[PDB]
């Protein structure tokens, strides 16, 4: 699932994980596992 409501989540993680994907669900963020 792709999110777009935070203070730069997928970013700080994308650096670590990579791919633009993420496991962020609900008001509970959680980048993906690339």
PDB file of N, CA, C and O in Angstrom:
ATOM      1  N   UNK A   1       0.841  -1.225   0.000  1.00  0.00           N
ATOM      2  CA  UNK A   1       0.000   0.000   0.000  1.00  0.00           C
ATOM      3  C   UNK A   1       0.863   1.258   0.000  1.00  0.00           C
ATOM      4  O   UNK A   1       1.885   1.322   0.684  1.00  0.00           O
ATOM      5  N   UNK A   2       0.444   2.257  -0.770  1.00  0.00           N
ATOM      6  CA  UNK A   2       1.179   3.513  -0.859  1.00  0.00           C
ATOM      7  C   UNK A   2       0.490   4.604  -0.045  1.00  0.00           C
ATOM      8  O   UNK A   2      -0.715   4.819  -0.171  1.00  0.00           O
ATOM      9  N   UNK A   3       1.264   5.290   0.790  1.00  0.00           N
ATOM     10  CA  UNK A   3       0.729   6.359   1.625  1.00  0.00           C
ATOM     11  C   UNK A   3       1.216   7.721   1.138  1.00  0.00           C
ATOM     12  O   UNK A   3       2.080   7.806   0.267  1.00  0.00           O
ATOM     13  N   UNK A   4       0.655   8.782   1.709  1.00  0.00           N
ATOM     14  CA  UNK A   4       1.033  10.140   1.331  1.00  0.00           C
ATOM     15  C   UNK A   4       0.557  11.149   2.371  1.00  0.00           C
ATOM     16  O   UNK A   4       0.252  12.295   2.043  1.00  0.00           O
ATOM     17  N   UNK A   5       0.499  10.715   3.625  1.00  0.00           N
ATOM     18  CA  UNK A   5       0.062  11.592   4.695  1.00  0.00           C
ATOM     19  C   UNK A   5       0.915  11.452   5.940  1.00  0.00           C
ATOM     20  O   UNK A   5       0.551  10.737   6.873  1.00  0.00           O
ATOM     21  N   UNK A   6       2.057  12.132   5.953  1.00  0.00           N
ATOM     22  CA  UNK A   6       2.967  12.076   7.089  1.00  0.00           C
ATOM     23  C   UNK A   6       3.978  13.220   7.036  1.00  0.00           C
ATOM     24  O   UNK A   6       3.742  14.240   6.387  1.00  0.00           O
ATOM     25  N   UNK A   7       5.106  13.047   7.720  1.00  0.00           N
ATOM     26  CA  UNK A   7       6.153  14.061   7.747  1.00  0.00           C
ATOM     27  C   UNK A   7       7.434  13.520   7.127  1.00  0.00           C
ATOM     28  O   UNK A   7       8.530  13.736   7.646  1.00  0.00           O
ATOM     29  N   UNK A   8       7.278  12.802   6.016  1.00  0.00           N
ATOM     30  CA  UNK A   8       8.404  12.202   5.299  1.00  0.00           C
ATOM     31  C   UNK A   8       8.764  10.850   5.902  1.00  0.00           C
ATOM     32  O   UNK A   8       9.757  10.714   6.616  1.00  0.00           O
ATOM     33  N   UNK A   9       7.938   9.860   5.608  1.00  0.00           N
ATOM     34  CA  UNK A   9       8.142   8.507   6.111  1.00  0.00           C
ATOM     35  C   UNK A   9       8.869   7.647   5.092  1.00  0.00           C
ATOM     36  O   UNK A   9       9.997   7.210   5.315  1.00  0.00           O
ATOM     37  N   UNK A  10       8.205   7.404   3.971  1.00  0.00           N
ATOM     38  CA  UNK A  10       8.770   6.592   2.901  1.00  0.00           C
ATOM     39  C   UNK A  10      10.174   7.064   2.526  1.00  0.00           C
ATOM     40  O   UNK A  10      10.966   6.297   1.983  1.00  0.00           O
ATOM     41  N   UNK A  11      10.474   8.329   2.807  1.00  0.00           N
ATOM     42  CA  UNK A  11      11.782   8.890   2.486  1.00  0.00           C
ATOM     43  C   UNK A  11      12.884   8.320   3.381  1.00  0.00           C
ATOM     44  O   UNK A  11      13.764   7.594   2.909  1.00  0.00           O
ATOM     45  N   UNK A  12      12.857   8.639   4.689  1.00  0.00           N
ATOM     46  CA  UNK A  12      13.861   8.158   5.642  1.00  0.00           C
ATOM     47  C   UNK A  12      14.048   6.648   5.568  1.00  0.00           C
ATOM     48  O   UNK A  12      15.108   6.125   5.914  1.00  0.00           O
ATOM     49  N   UNK A  13      13.014   5.953   5.112  1.00  0.00           N
ATOM     50  CA  UNK A  13      13.066   4.504   4.988  1.00  0.00           C
ATOM     51  C   UNK A  13      13.565   4.089   3.613  1.00  0.00           C
ATOM     52  O   UNK A  13      14.441   3.237   3.497  1.00  0.00           O
ATOM     53  N   UNK A  14      13.000   4.692   2.568  1.00  0.00           N
ATOM     54  CA  UNK A  14      13.391   4.374   1.204  1.00  0.00           C
ATOM     55  C   UNK A  14      14.903   4.365   1.076  1.00  0.00           C
ATOM     56  O   UNK A  14      15.472   3.543   0.358  1.00  0.00           O
ATOM     57  N   UNK A  15      15.557   5.262   1.799  1.00  0.00           N
ATOM     58  CA  UNK A  15      17.008   5.315   1.777  1.00  0.00           C
ATOM     59  C   UNK A  15      17.556   3.964   2.220  1.00  0.00           C
ATOM     60  O   UNK A  15      18.429   3.386   1.574  1.00  0.00           O
ATOM     61  N   UNK A  16      17.015   3.468   3.330  1.00  0.00           N
ATOM     62  CA  UNK A  16      17.416   2.181   3.878  1.00  0.00           C
ATOM     63  C   UNK A  16      16.925   1.014   3.017  1.00  0.00           C
ATOM     64  O   UNK A  16      17.723   0.222   2.516  1.00  0.00           O
ATOM     65  N   UNK A  17      15.602   0.897   2.873  1.00  0.00           N
ATOM     66  CA  UNK A  17      15.003  -0.191   2.104  1.00  0.00           C
ATOM     67  C   UNK A  17      15.240  -0.045   0.607  1.00  0.00           C
ATOM     68  O   UNK A  17      15.719  -0.970  -0.048  1.00  0.00           O
ATOM     69  N   UNK A  18      14.885   1.110   0.069  1.00  0.00           N
ATOM     70  CA  UNK A  18      15.046   1.353  -1.338  1.00  0.00           C
ATOM     71  C   UNK A  18      13.736   1.677  -2.020  1.00  0.00           C
ATOM     72  O   UNK A  18      13.157   2.738  -1.796  1.00  0.00           O
ATOM     73  N   UNK A  19      13.294   0.754  -2.863  1.00  0.00           N
ATOM     74  CA  UNK A  19      12.055   0.885  -3.624  1.00  0.00           C
ATOM     75  C   UNK A  19      11.034   1.818  -2.963  1.00  0.00           C
ATOM     76  O   UNK A  19      10.957   1.904  -1.737  1.00  0.00           O
ATOM     77  N   UNK A  20      10.238   2.535  -3.778  1.00  0.00           N
ATOM     78  CA  UNK A  20       9.225   3.478  -3.279  1.00  0.00           C
ATOM     79  C   UNK A  20       8.078   2.809  -2.518  1.00  0.00           C
ATOM     80  O   UNK A  20       7.223   3.494  -1.960  1.00  0.00           O
ATOM     81  N   UNK A  21       8.052   1.480  -2.499  1.00  0.00           N
ATOM     82  CA  UNK A  21       7.008   0.755  -1.814  1.00  0.00           C
ATOM     83  C   UNK A  21       7.133   0.910  -0.301  1.00  0.00           C
ATOM     84  O   UNK A  21       8.167   1.342   0.208  1.00  0.00           O
ATOM     85  N   UNK A  22       6.067   0.555   0.411  1.00  0.00           N
ATOM     86  CA  UNK A  22       6.066   0.660   1.861  1.00  0.00           C
ATOM     87  C   UNK A  22       4.987  -0.190   2.505  1.00  0.00           C
ATOM     88  O   UNK A  22       3.976  -0.492   1.874  1.00  0.00           O
ATOM     89  N   UNK A  23       5.188  -0.564   3.770  1.00  0.00           N
ATOM     90  CA  UNK A  23       4.202  -1.364   4.481  1.00  0.00           C
ATOM     91  C   UNK A  23       3.385  -0.476   5.416  1.00  0.00           C
ATOM     92  O   UNK A  23       2.772  -0.954   6.370  1.00  0.00           O
ATOM     93  N   UNK A  24       3.396   0.824   5.132  1.00  0.00           N
ATOM     94  CA  UNK A  24       2.675   1.798   5.936  1.00  0.00           C
ATOM     95  C   UNK A  24       1.166   1.595   5.819  1.00  0.00           C
ATOM     96  O   UNK A  24       0.582   1.767   4.751  1.00  0.00           O
ATOM     97  N   UNK A  25       0.547   1.241   6.939  1.00  0.00           N
ATOM     98  CA  UNK A  25      -0.892   1.026   6.996  1.00  0.00           C
ATOM     99  C   UNK A  25      -1.483   1.864   8.110  1.00  0.00           C
ATOM    100  O   UNK A  25      -0.849   2.073   9.150  1.00  0.00           O
ATOM    101  N   UNK A  26      -2.686   2.377   7.898  1.00  0.00           N
ATOM    102  CA  UNK A  26      -3.300   3.208   8.917  1.00  0.00           C
ATOM    103  C   UNK A  26      -2.333   4.274   9.347  1.00  0.00           C
ATOM    104  O   UNK A  26      -1.275   4.482   8.751  1.00  0.00           O
ATOM    105  N   UNK A  27      -2.716   4.924  10.386  1.00  0.00           N
ATOM    106  CA  UNK A  27      -1.922   5.992  10.976  1.00  0.00           C
ATOM    107  C   UNK A  27      -0.619   5.434  11.510  1.00  0.00           C
ATOM    108  O   UNK A  27       0.157   6.116  12.178  1.00  0.00           O
ATOM    109  N   UNK A  28      -0.402   4.183  11.177  1.00  0.00           N
ATOM    110  CA  UNK A  28       0.809   3.466  11.577  1.00  0.00           C
ATOM    111  C   UNK A  28       1.714   3.201  10.373  1.00  0.00           C
ATOM    112  O   UNK A  28       1.484   2.272   9.599  1.00  0.00           O
ATOM    113  N   UNK A  29       2.748   4.024  10.223  1.00  0.00           N
ATOM    114  CA  UNK A  29       3.688   3.884   9.118  1.00  0.00           C
ATOM    115  C   UNK A  29       4.544   2.634   9.274  1.00  0.00           C
ATOM    116  O   UNK A  29       4.617   2.052  10.355  1.00  0.00           O
ATOM    117  N   UNK A  30       5.197   2.232   8.188  1.00  0.00           N
ATOM    118  CA  UNK A  30       6.057   1.056   8.204  1.00  0.00           C
ATOM    119  C   UNK A  30       6.528   0.702   6.801  1.00  0.00           C
ATOM    120  O   UNK A  30       5.935  -0.134   6.129  1.00  0.00           O
ATOM    121  N   UNK A  31       7.609   1.346   6.381  1.00  0.00           N
ATOM    122  CA  UNK A  31       8.211   1.120   5.061  1.00  0.00           C
ATOM    123  C   UNK A  31       8.212  -0.344   4.666  1.00  0.00           C
ATOM    124  O   UNK A  31       7.869  -1.229   5.443  1.00  0.00           O
ATOM    125  N   UNK A  32       8.566  -0.563   3.421  1.00  0.00           N
ATOM    126  CA  UNK A  32       8.610  -1.892   2.844  1.00  0.00           C
ATOM    127  C   UNK A  32       9.943  -2.573   3.113  1.00  0.00           C
ATOM    128  O   UNK A  32      10.845  -1.992   3.718  1.00  0.00           O
ATOM    129  N   UNK A  33      10.056  -3.802   2.639  1.00  0.00           N
ATOM    130  CA  UNK A  33      11.276  -4.584   2.799  1.00  0.00           C
ATOM    131  C   UNK A  33      11.855  -4.932   1.434  1.00  0.00           C
ATOM    132  O   UNK A  33      11.513  -5.957   0.844  1.00  0.00           O
ATOM    133  N   UNK A  34      12.722  -4.061   0.938  1.00  0.00           N
ATOM    134  CA  UNK A  34      13.344  -4.253  -0.361  1.00  0.00           C
ATOM    135  C   UNK A  34      14.550  -5.181  -0.268  1.00  0.00           C
ATOM    136  O   UNK A  34      14.569  -6.199  -0.994  1.00  0.00           O
TER     137      UNK A  34
END
